[PDB]
């Protein structure tokens, strides 16, 4: 009956909170002071949470789900009723956990030592990361490229292949078709008369949007291919694709590494206000004072005053074993925390906001029920933060705070520079993010047989992304498997859509804030109406389906790429002068070895 469930959730939403509160507290105190006993102190406290969750997860199968009328309490149960696992055989249950951490550690133990010296054996993050980052040798970086996946992804191929098998039989037992059907399940919204959203339709949305920016991605690929013959002569054909080992990193996800060799005007001094901070004695408190001062200027509340003492802003002065990574902690009960190691640059001034925006986003839905206290979908949490770092990259913001000289003249030669730094980050990842998740689902839905999983992988890298392999690969390298979120079982579509949601938030506020210049010069600061429309969306969390939540700021019900191509128009005006002689297009037949 309906009235038995609406009292049951009033039991669950009090006994879960104080057991959630300590389980995040032990992961906080361990991460700021690493010992051995605090490894143990967070294991059982985290085991108090997992056993309690599987305790009440089986209770939601007592209630039938479709006899409920209130959608609010209907949304809480359908998340809680989700088994995930526990539906299979238990020797088969441990069989995946036998696979899972073994899949996890092989990625983390990948060691590489030279044929000339097998005694110096590098890991991935020390050295091997720096080879693809700054070293500019061709014959070096092909050796580092091949010997990584042939020594890591060769071994996970008999690990992942059987792991696709037992993932889907659990997934079909929750009445799906594959594991690709499960990941779409965060976007699925059923039965609310006009805001409805089915799982298969996002394939249609990503296939419509990505074809529209394909001029631009062909144009950055044309421009950089006009630039790479200088830094790499006699290695890349100017008609064909690029080899896969010089792309900025090991897989070339980000192209931020390629600003230096591909700068528009190398004699033009980019703004890096680092020396300005040290000549005014800018400590750690001065940085987060302005970051809070910007958010009160937009129309959002202060910090909670228990944020300051309870957070760790710097590294400690003692030799203190603590993981250093800028994260925002959201423990509950009005306690929100930050943790990083500040070094006073303009770069850490930028990430000082992207983490603070996560706090004010988690300061927003604090009045929600417990099972709804996230973003409206999985792409919204990193989307709301990164648009706050975009507002600090405007030079009018910095000279208004008293950091730039008032006679700073924004010439258009640095605007062609500054937008080209963004374009190797924003547009550089989206043919990467789509080309993997397109590949992962046909493997998931079984459209490719296992003897062709690599065969159809290295096809679609060439046509969509315009990258050619250094080495011909037979079926024995698991070249997709070598990536972090690939090897660690993570949903990769949350990085594509997060970019699209950003600018739809961005220009709609810059329309509200009455900007008249280009999109990269609008400023959200000093406005109130740009804060009021945004605060309308932030207080929802998951109490509303996101299709209603997105139109609360913009006015549409799906992701719209037309704000994104509004950004690059001063750039794309300049860029079309640079393809008057070069060939925008790649031939996917040429390889660096077939000559």
């Amino acid at each position: 009956i309906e009235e038995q469930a609406k009292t049951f959730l009033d039991k669950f939403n009090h006994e879960a909170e104080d057991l959630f509160y300590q389980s995040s507290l032990a992961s906080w105190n361990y991460n700021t002071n690493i010992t051995e006993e605090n490894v143990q102190n967070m294991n059982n406290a985290g085991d108090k949470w997992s056993a309690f969750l599987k305790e009440q997860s089986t209770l939601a199968q007592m209630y039938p789900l479709q006899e409920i009328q209130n959608l609010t309490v209907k949304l809480q149960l359908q998340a809680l009723q989700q088994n995930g696992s526990s539906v299979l055989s238990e020797d088969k249950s441990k069989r995946l956990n036998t696979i899972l951490n073994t899949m996890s550690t092989i990625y983390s133990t990948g060691k590489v030592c030279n044929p000339d010296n097998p005694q110096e054996c590098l890991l991935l993050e020390p050295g091997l990361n720096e080879i693809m980052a700054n070293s500019l040798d061709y014959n070096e970086r092909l050796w580092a490229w091949e010997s990584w996946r042939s020594e890591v992804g060769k071994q996970l191929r008999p690990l992942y292949e059987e792991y696709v098998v037992l993932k889907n039989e659990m997934a079909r037992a929750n009445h799906y078709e594959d594991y690709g059907d499960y990941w779409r399940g965060d976007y699925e919204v059923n039965g609310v008369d006009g805001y409805d959203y089915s799982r298969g339709q996002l394939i249609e949305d990503v296939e419509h949007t990505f074809e529209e920016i394909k001029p631009l991605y062909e144009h950055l690929h044309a421009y950089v291919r006009a630039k790479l013959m200088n830094a790499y002569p006699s290695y890349i054909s100017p008609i064909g694709c690029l080899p896969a080992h010089l792309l900025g990193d090991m897989w070339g996800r980000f192209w931020t590494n390629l600003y230096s060799l591909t700068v528009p005007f190398g004699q033009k001094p980019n703004i890096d206000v680092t020396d300005a901070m040290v000549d005014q004695a800018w400590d750690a408190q001065r940085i987060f004072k302005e970051a809070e001062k910007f958010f009160v200027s937009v129309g959002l509340p202060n910090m909670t005053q228990g944020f300051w003492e309870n957070s760790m802003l710097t590294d400690p002065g003692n030799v203190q074993k603590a993981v250093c990574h800028p994260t925002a902690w959201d423990l509950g009960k009005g306690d929100f925390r930050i943790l990083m190691c500040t070094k006073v640059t303009m770069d850490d001034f930028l990430t000082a906001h992207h983490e603070m925006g996560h706090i004010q986003y988690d300061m927003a839905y604090a009045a929600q029920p417990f099972l709804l206290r996230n973003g409206a979908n999985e792409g919204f949490h990193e989307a709301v933060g990164e648009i706050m770092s975009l507002s600090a990259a405007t030079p009018k913001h910095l000279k208004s705070i008293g950091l730039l000289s008032p006679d700073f003249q924004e010439d258009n030669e640095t605007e062609i520079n500054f937008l080209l730094k963004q374009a190797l980050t924003i547009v550089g990842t989206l043919p990467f993010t789509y080309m993997l998740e397109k590949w992962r689902w046909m493997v998931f839905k079984g459209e490719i047989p296992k003897d062709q999983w690599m065969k159809k992988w290295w096809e679609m890298k060439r046509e969509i992304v315009g990258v050619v392999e250094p080495v011909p690969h037979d079926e024995t390298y698991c070249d997709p498997a070598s990536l972090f979120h690939v090897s660690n079982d993570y949903s990769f579509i949350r990085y594509y859509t997060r970019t699209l949601y950003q600018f739809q938030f961005q220009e709609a506020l810059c329309q509200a804030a009455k900007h008249e210049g280009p999109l990269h010069k609008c400023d959200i600061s000093n406005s109130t109406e740009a804060g009021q429309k945004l605060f309308n969306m932030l207080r929802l969390g998951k109490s509303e389906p996101w299709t209603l939540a997105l139109e609360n700021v913009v006015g549409a019900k799906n992701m719209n790429v037309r704000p994104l191509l509004n950004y690059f128009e001063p750039l794309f005006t300049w860029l079309k002068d640079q393809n008057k002689n070069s060939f925008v297009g790649w031939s996917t037949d040429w390889s660096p070895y077939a000559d």
Binding site: I1, K11, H14, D18, Y21, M62, G306, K333, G334, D335
Partner: protein
Amino acid sequence: GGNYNYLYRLFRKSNLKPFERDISTEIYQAGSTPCNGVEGFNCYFPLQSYGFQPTNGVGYQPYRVVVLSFELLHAPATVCGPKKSTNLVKNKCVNFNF
């Protein structure tokens, strides 16, 4: 470590009268099935406890609450606020209240 020595009642069949007090601990049943005096499905103990840690945000920290209410039933002389008294003077035509 959690000061769990403060409890609150989350379950009742009926809302209270004004000023009503219920110190009973009778085991609440939400569902149709009886329980034979034990807990179980739709069948809950009607007291829960406050989790209190000193590193909690405002709105989740305990407040010490004092509720007043005056009454005037039929009593002759009762209590009341304090009545101040100015300095007394002498030998001058004055307006006094004793």
